[PDB]
Amino acid sequence: PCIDLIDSLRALGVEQDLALPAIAVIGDQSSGKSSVLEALSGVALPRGSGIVTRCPLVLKLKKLVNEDKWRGKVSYQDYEIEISDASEVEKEINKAQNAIAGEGMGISHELITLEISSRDVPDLTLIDLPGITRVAVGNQPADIGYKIKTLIKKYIQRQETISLVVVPSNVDIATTEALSMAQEVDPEGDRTIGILTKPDLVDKGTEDKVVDVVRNLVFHLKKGYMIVKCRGQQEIQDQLSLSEALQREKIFFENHPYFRDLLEEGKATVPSLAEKLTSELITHISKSLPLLENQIKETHQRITEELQKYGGDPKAKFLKERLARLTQARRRLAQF
Amino acid sequence: XXXXXXXXXXXXLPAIAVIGDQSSGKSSVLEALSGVALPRGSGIVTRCPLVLKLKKLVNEDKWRGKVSYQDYEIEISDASEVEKEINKAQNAIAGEGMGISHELITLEISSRDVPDLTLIDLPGITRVAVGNQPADIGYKIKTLIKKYIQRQETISLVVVPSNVDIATTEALSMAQEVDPEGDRTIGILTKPDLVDKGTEDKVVDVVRNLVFHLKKGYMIVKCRGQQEIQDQLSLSEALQREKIFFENHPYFRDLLEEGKATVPSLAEKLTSELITHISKSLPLLXXXXXXXXXXXXXXXXXX
Ligand SMILES: Nc1nc2c(ncn2[C@@H]2O[C@H](COP(=O)(O)OP(=O)(O)CP(=O)(O)O)[C@@H](O)[C@H]2O)c(=O)[nH]1
Ligand SMILES: Nc1nc2c(ncn2[C@@H]2O[C@H](COP(=O)(O)OP(=O)(O)CP(=O)(O)O)[C@@H](O)[C@H]2O)c(=O)[nH]1
Numbered sequence A: 001p002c003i004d005l006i007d008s009l010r011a012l013g014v015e016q017d018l019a020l021p022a023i024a025v026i027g028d029q030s031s032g033k034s035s036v037l038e039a040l041s042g043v044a045l046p047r048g049s050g051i052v053t054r055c056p057l058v059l060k061l062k063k064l065v066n067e068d069k070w071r072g073k074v075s076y077q078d079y080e081i082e083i084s085d086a087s088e089v090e091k092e093i094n095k096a097q098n099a100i101a102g103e104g105m106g107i108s109h110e111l112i113t114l115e116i117s118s119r120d121v122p123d124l125t126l127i128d129l130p131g132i133t134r135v136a137v138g139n140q141p142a143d144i145g146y147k148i149k150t151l152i153k154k155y156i157q158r159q160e161t162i163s164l165v166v167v168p169s170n171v172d173i174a175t176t177e178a179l180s181m182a183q184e185v186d187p188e189g190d191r192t193i194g195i196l197t198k199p200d201l202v203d204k205g206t207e208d209k210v211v212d213v214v215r216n217l218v219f220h221l222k223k224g225y226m227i228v229k230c231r232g233q234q235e236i237q238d239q240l241s242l243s244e245a246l247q248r249e250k251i252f253f254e255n256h257p258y259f260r261d262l263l264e265e266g267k268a269t270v271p272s273l274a275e276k277l278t279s280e281l282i283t284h285i286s287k288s289l290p291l292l293e294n295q296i297k298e299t300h301q302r303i304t305e306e307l308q309k310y311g312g313d314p315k316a317k318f319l320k321e322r323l324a325r326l327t328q329a330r331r332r333l334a335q336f
Numbered sequence B: 001x002x003x004x005x006x007x008x009x010x011x012x013l014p015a016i017a018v019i020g021d022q023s024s025g026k027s028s029v030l031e032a033l034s035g036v037a038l039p040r041g042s043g044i045v046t047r048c049p050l051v052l053k054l055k056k057l058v059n060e061d062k063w064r065g066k067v068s069y070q071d072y073e074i075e076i077s078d079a080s081e082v083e084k085e086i087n088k089a090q091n092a093i094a095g096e097g098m099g100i101s102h103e104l105i106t107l108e109i110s111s112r113d114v115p116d117l118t119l120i121d122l123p124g125i126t127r128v129a130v131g132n133q134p135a136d137i138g139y140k141i142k143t144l145i146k147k148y149i150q151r152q153e154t155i156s157l158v159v160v161p162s163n164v165d166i167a168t169t170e171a172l173s174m175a176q177e178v179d180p181e182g183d184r185t186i187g188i189l190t191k192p193d194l195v196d197k198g199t200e201d202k203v204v205d206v207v208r209n210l211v212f213h214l215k216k217g218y219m220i221v222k223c224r225g226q227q228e229i230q231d232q233l234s235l236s237e238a239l240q241r242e243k244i245f246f247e248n249h250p251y252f253r254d255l256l257e258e259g260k261a262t263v264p265s266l267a268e269k270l271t272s273e274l275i276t277h278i279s280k281s282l283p284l285l286x287x288x289x290x291x292x293x294x295x296x297x298x299x300x301x302x303x
């Protein structure tokens, strides 16, 4: 339903005219941020040990309710390369990175644009960004750390961008540069969410502390915290199916003493976060929505006249139906 | 070499600072070397600077311990009392909550079992104020740390957990700031028992000094996990495990066998290091000997 609410809007031609926010993942080097984005997107963004996201990537996901068949494309500088298989995604994204950032461990401002259109993926915009380092290593220069922070601010400063702060459960949250960085650009936290990761790697004894953090009890966020567990590095090497990974996460929380609670509180798991985010997204649409009624109405009335002529025709079936949904929706949402 | 320091000790100074992030195990290192009960724990547990002055006795076979700050110079009559007392000091001085203070604590311990040494615990680096501290806490702390590591005497001991990508380590930057060529800098890795399975080769590299380079190079150890602190585990028992832990542990066996893992290694390592600076820093005290001699020439001038 409301998950297809957006497609209806896309049908009313207001998706261009109002598109709601993107979602950025900001946090330290190797804090699992690509792993979150991959977890939500179900697309193979490079995840790993060390320096693995080496320049910004926008992922534009679009649902298919009509043709139902896979699509994927990359774009940067000179190239708009076509990808003919989901298999190829990670391979290609690293091609892009090598090409663009220079094949070592240096990074670049230059954006990558992945656009994927599929049945299984949700309507969404996500943004991977490199991790915060505070020290240049191998072949990067002194001010790398700063370079990166500049690059990150340049995304989270936009009003559209929902900052998703990604922290591992095994670091004292007060260490978390990205929280400071977030409230800098979002003083009252209306586009900010805290994600904990690597819960499976906490020191035995310290799990109460972690819980508090997530019960939003040590550093306060307005929109509050989530916690998940992604593929550990072993599980990446073993190429584990996403669906299998999502399985474990459930098991993991389901049978984990301290953290059981956080699940039962709607505060753990990814499908939680997915849902959570959707509402976040859902809120912004609603806020924007009264200001598009003329487009929405005109459009609807323009479509109804188109299809009214095709009246008692079979070929209208698909769209005579499609319209229908749009209509019912609108009446109720407006009544709101 | 151990004796050269006793010849130096006989004539009555290098110190060693532990700098690193909040909950990175730094107090745990200093406790590991000192065998004294410095408050180590979850969250914010070193909440203002402490100088530990250790002095060997083969003479007395008597334990001694004293704390000092602001006014107080409190006597401690049992090693049992140390942690209790250090928290009393902290509460007294920093204000009970989570806020910190520049004000130094001075523990002086004299015992058989402890080495001749000077160590400095310092609070962890936070980058965000929580509960009852103010915005610029993070900076307050960094100022406080620089104020110790900037001295030439101070051997900066950077403490990193094995489960953070080393490039995240603020304290490394902070160290080269005040020690460009790395003649008083050592990297310690901790919590090796908390690495993600798969990433252990990476850790090793770090320690083989292969991802961020230090002149004096790296060590790695494992200290009481929080459970083991709640279970009050004997130090000697903890030192036992560390040996087991590395001894039977696949990737990290090597690092042991390379003299690059364990505490008794680090102890030995540091000792050599420490000796360097005495030899290095001695000319300034020959200068003070002048002062002493000229003050003494008054005694002879009086007769
Ligand atoms: N055990 C465990 N490991 C995890 C979890 N999430 C991620 N990891 C592991 O941590 C590492 C970091 O994940 P990744 O998504 O690559 O972090 P990243 O922030 O994207 C790397 P960069 O900062 O350069 O973008 C990977 O080795 C991954 O397998 C988790 O929940 N549990
Ligand atoms: N699992 C494991 N845990 C460790 C290790 N070293 C320390 N810890 C744990 O992490 C916590 C940190 O110890 P502590 O000495 O407080 O670190 P710290 O950096 O001095 C804390 P602060 O910054 O507040 O002064 C303790 O709970 C301890 O049990 C280790 O080698 N392995």
Ligand SMILES: [Mg+2]
Residues within 6 Å of the ligand: A033, A034, A035, A046, A047, A048, A052, A053
């Ligand atoms: Mg990444």
Ligand SMILES: [Mg+2]
Residues within 6 Å of the ligand: B026, B027, B028, B039, B040, B041, B045, B046, B121, B122, B123, B124
């Ligand atoms: Mg401490």
